[PDB]
Amino acid sequence: TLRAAVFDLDGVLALPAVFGVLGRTEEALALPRGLLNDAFQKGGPEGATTRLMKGEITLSQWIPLMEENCRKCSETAKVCLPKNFSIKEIFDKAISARKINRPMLQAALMLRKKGFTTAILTNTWLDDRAERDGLAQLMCELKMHFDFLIESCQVGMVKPEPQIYKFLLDTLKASPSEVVFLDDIGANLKPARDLGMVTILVQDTDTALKELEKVTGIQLLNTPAPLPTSCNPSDMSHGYVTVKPRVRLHFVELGSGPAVCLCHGFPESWYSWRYQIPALAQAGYRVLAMDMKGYGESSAPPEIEEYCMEVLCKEMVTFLDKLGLSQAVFIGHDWGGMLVWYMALFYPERVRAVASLNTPFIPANPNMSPLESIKANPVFDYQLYFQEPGVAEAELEQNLSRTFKSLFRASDESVLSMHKVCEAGGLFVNSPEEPSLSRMVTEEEIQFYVQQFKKSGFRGPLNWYRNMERNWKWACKSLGRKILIPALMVTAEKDFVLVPQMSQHMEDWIPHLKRGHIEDCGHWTQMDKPTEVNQILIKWLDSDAR
């Protein structure tokens, strides 16, 4: 029974193969066929390329050795190398043309999800070229989806030498019959076959995956679209900033580039952005996913006034000051979305761009108190249940697992009313004791929220709703303003509280507003439709926030 799958990089996980590109360069330069391969392989196990692949010399040390082999080959073939001949240029182009073979990576991901140990085994070099970052980025994106990365130049061995196969087996902690090995080089499969491993010669991706599908008995081709990459909390970089003596803010950080600050809703976590964090970092952004004040590993002071928007926004400004950031792109959802609009209104100099999921820009009504506004808008009547300190805390804290399983559901899986919360005296009054698990979440994901809420519970989170008068008076100071910085409003078709029509007057305040809209999406946008959220955010960030 197969338990491990090994992939080569060049010609397998990354396409085109370097020598595929070079065959075309050879033809374009009108060189004799095979001259570059011949000069590359010159001396075989005793040659310059074996020294390179074993890590004895760097790629920059190897370049002139390859140039000399090309001259020797051309002299013997009685041909002249062209005037502009440069191994540096030729190899730079071949390395840069190489991109992840997405169907191959998808198959490796499916196998690992099904319990396989996966590895990359590659003949590679120590890259010290001025352009080395390109290949470093590619390797970084690939390696994180595998249990092991074995590089010839780091282990001092190369394929097809038999010792590297014994090293692979030792690394995998598996017998050869438990391994499936994929390579586009027939001579590199021979030692693996020799030991008793299943081997697949990768000539074309589709045929190779068909052989892999048959031997593993796992569907790899024609599969449903996979979810974006998620986060394992224990593998993230965790950051902590004290904004004031009693308040520290926790965040998860990933990537490099413009800072993108993600602000979750109620009652959530930095983990609500799990499908966005890897995607936004891969897209070229430095992601800062907050635990907002009152949540997770951030401080949760008991006082209501610690959660008014003016205080919360001031603290987010301090957060940027202490990290040494003049600006960040602010992306919010739900209560986070409300906060980000207000960051754009009061601190535009610190906000590079602003985006909200579901929450429209809600201006203060100077002619009505927030309680009179709730009276005139009964879709928000449930917020009255959140007013009295202790009442909603008692219901939400009674059974954390039940709380999160009842809340985090798709539009069609709703177990909550919302419209009759006050009349019924609670959120879960007509909800089951043991709700089924939504198709959106796994039991493990639910238990992470349960664990997070065991620290401070719901007092801090509910206090976000307990500052209506303070928030109203503060928001009234901004009534003569317009939001003129780059802005995106994303609506969700099936959010029955934050309906898309609630955002219809936003252009009155934000004239240059850009929009996104997600079909068949409920309230929990990030986990309901992660692929769609990612596409919308990346397109907008790349056009408006760079």
281: partner contacted, choices a second copy, ligand HD2, none (Cβ within 5-8 A by kind): a second copy
- The residue annotated as part of the active site, out of 465, 495, 528, 544, is 465
Stretch that binds a second copy, among 1-9, 75-83, 267-275, 316-324 (CB under 8 A): 316-324
Cβ proximity to a second copy: between 285 and 404 the closer is 285
Determine whether the annotation assigns residue 10 to a binding site: yes
Window 364-393: contact mask with ligand HD2 (x via CB under 6 A): -x----x--xx--x--x--x----------
Q: Is 523 a catalytic residue?
A: yes
122 labeled binding residue: yes
Binding of ligand HD2 at residue 18 (CB under 6 A)?
A: yes
Choosing from 2, 5, 36, 49, the residue that interacts with ligand HD2 (CB under 6 A) is 49
Quick one: what does residue 373 bind among ligand HD2, a second copy, none, with the CB cut-off 5 to 8 Å set by partner type? ligand HD2
Rounded distance between C-alpha atoms, residue 461 and residue 514, angstroms = 30
d(CA 398, CA 396): 6
The per-residue DSSP string of 129-158 comes to STTTHHHHHHHHHHHTTSSEEEEHHHHT--
Catalytic residue among 291, 334, 528, 544: 334
Return d(Cα 283, Cα 256) in angstroms, integer. Answer: 10
Q: Is 69 annotated as a binding residue?
A: no
204 three-class SS: coil
Query: Which position among 271, 449, 523, 528 bears the catalytic label?
Result: 523
Residue 147 touches a second copy, criterion: CB under 8 A: no
Whole-number Å distance between alpha carbons of 312 and 292: 9
> Quick one: tokens of 3?
């338990």
Contact call for residue 476 and a second copy (CB under 8 A): no
Q: How many residues bind a second copy (CB under 8 A)?
A: 58
**Residues whose CB is less than 8 angstroms from the CB of residue 158 and which lie 6 or more positions away in sequence, other chains included:** 50, 53, 54, 123, 152, 164
Residue 184 DSSP label: S
Q: Answer whether 351's CB lies under 8 Å from 327's CB.
A: yes
* Residue 145 annotated in active site: no
Minimum Å gap between C-beta 23 and ligand HD2 is 7
User: Sign of torsion, CA 425 430 434 440?
Assistant: negative
CA 460, CA 453: separation in Å to the nearest integer?
11
Q: Please select the residue that binds ligand HD2; options are 74, 106, 123, 171, rule is CB under 6 A.
A: 123
Interaction of residue 41 with ligand HD2, rule CB under 6 A: yes
Q: Which residues, in sequence order, are CB contacts of 246 under 8 Å at separation 6+?
A: 299, 301
| 306 sits near ligand HD2 (criterion: CB under 6 A) | no
**Burial class (CB within 10 angstroms; exposed 0-12, middle 13-18, buried 19+) of 113:** exposed
Token pair, residue 195, equals 């030991």
Q: How far apart are CA 219 and CA 470, in angstroms?
A: 57
According to the binding rule CB under 6 A, does residue 34 interact with ligand HD2?
A: no
Q: Is 523 a residue that touches ligand HD2 (CB under 6 A)?
A: yes
Question: Considering only residues 328-357, where is the footprint of a second copy by CB under 8 A?
Answer: 346, 348-350, 352
CA angle 456, 459, 461 (to 5 degrees): 90
Binding residues vs a second copy (CB under 8 A): 51, 55-58, 60-61, 126-128, 132-133, 135-137, 139-140, 143-144, 154, 156, 234-242, 253-256, 259, 281, 286-287, 321-327, 346, 348-350, 352, 477-478, 480-485
| Residues labelled as active-site residues | 334, 465, 523
Binding residues vs ligand HD2 (CB under 6 A): 10-11, 17-20, 40-41, 44-45, 49-50, 53, 123, 158, 184-185, 266, 334-335, 338, 359, 362, 365, 370, 373-374, 377, 380, 383, 407, 414, 416, 418, 495-498, 502, 505, 523
